[PDB]
Write a protein that binds this ligand. Sequence first.
Ligand SMILES: Cc1ccc(-c2cnc(-c3ccccc3C(=O)Nc3c(C)n(C)n(-c4ccccc4)c3=O)o2)cc1
Ligand SMILES: N[C@H](CCC(=O)O)C(=O)O
Ligand SMILES: N[C@H](CCC(=O)O)C(=O)O
Lengths: 249, 247
Amino acid sequence: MKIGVFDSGVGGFSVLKSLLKARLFDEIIYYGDSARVPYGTKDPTTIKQFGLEALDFFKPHEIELLIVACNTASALALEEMQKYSKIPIVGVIEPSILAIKRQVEDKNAPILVLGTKATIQSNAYDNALKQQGYLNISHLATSLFVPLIEESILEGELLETCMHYYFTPLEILPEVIILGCTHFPLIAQKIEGYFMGHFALPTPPLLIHSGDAIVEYLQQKYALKFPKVEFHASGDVIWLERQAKEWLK
Amino acid sequence: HMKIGVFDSGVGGFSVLKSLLKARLFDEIIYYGDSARVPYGTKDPTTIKQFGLEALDFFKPHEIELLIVACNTASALALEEMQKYSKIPIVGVIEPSILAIKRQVEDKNAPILVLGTKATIQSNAYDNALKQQGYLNISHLATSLFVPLIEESILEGELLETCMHYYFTPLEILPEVIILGCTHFPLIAQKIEGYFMGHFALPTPPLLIHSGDAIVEYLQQKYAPKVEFHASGDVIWLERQAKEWLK
Ligand SMILES: Cc1ccc(-c2cnc(-c3ccccc3C(=O)Nc3c(C)n(C)n(-c4ccccc4)c3=O)o2)cc1
Ligand SMILES: N[C@H](CCC(=O)O)C(=O)O
Ligand SMILES: N[C@H](CCC(=O)O)C(=O)O
């Protein structure tokens, strides 16, 4: 069972981490479009075309399944890629909606979606959630989290000031926070720390992680069976691969 | 008079275009921002060099007489390769700033601080050019996060101040001259001035070198209105930015 994983860059390693721990696949071809990252600050037309070009990369690798680890590509390009692909394509949004259906029974629970500008602007999460009957959805583009995390700024004053900048205007205290971006799991503890410490909460809000959600879904569709992993990039492949160890820690 | 091209990785090049429009230098300007692939400064030399070659292909049907590479990163990494494969003159934004420093900084021991993207700083393009002119006291600092902050319009407040503190606190030298070696940095030039002035009891701010004003000065010494906007990403998104950056 040979599969491909597509991301705009290194963020997809957060999904790869979950896929490796699932012992579901024999071979994984990871491709990050690191020459053109980020996607989330760009426009739907551009991102759709990026997604179609990603299918071109995987043709010669004869994969049986393509995972779109990128939340931005999942939000803007997945439907377009599915129309032009003969093989199945799974993105990271729809499996997250199923995880919310299992873990969040109160349809009035305040849910906060965090993502790139493009992910939030698409309303992909809001639309899917509303389709399942959720009525209390807020969304917030937290663009600068992405470059901060890529510089390894995972704690301290800069992160906290950035976190305050985005979260201060919040009118509803969330019970659920969707980490609708590959990078955000790396600051999950800091995000929950912010809400406990600024809203005097007993426990933290519940965080939904895209990689864990897609694993749950994939396991419902594939038998249980350390896979072989290849790394490829449109920028320097060593600059990409050498960061894997730090993301898969 | 000359029809010219201006190339940048995205919208930052509007800081250079603004200077060009103020000076009323050229009759016709074709601006191209590679907004589908920005930023360049966080990527590797091989990638950036190829981006620079591809920009030349864009301008071929426009019959330009001069190409200004407004991007400091492309100037630092791709200019030589671009000039090799192009029939038309190409001017980047690094060498005109060296000329500006030579005119404005007569003390070869004056502490000069170069700010730029990761790729611009790693290239040592500025340090090498300054050393060849006899400057003896050069420091450099990549300030990568200034780029996304400025593109989000974070031009004041606690987040910008904390980011400046993050990059500048480890500095060992107090600069007399600061090179704004990135298209985006003129938009926080007053804040950078204010950082050093406050944190260091300076009577006057360090001299800031603006790439756009330096290249205007240079072009006036060599070549003693219509603008069109093109983009690899959505062109209306780039135009919306043009209105804000060029105001
Ligand atoms: C068991 C094994 C087998 C082959 C190699 C190998 C081959 N060429 C590299 C290489 C070259 C340059 C820069 C970085 C690396 C690197 O190390 N690449 C990683 C891989 C391939 N894998 C699978 N992982 C990983 C996965 C999960 C958790 C932690 C690490 C890597 O980090 O390494 C490493 C180990
Ligand atoms: N991979 C993107 C984050 C980085 C980018 O903007 O490309 C996402 O999951 O939204
Ligand atoms: N235009 C780039 C900044 C943005 C980027 O990294 O592409 C520069 O002047 O260095």
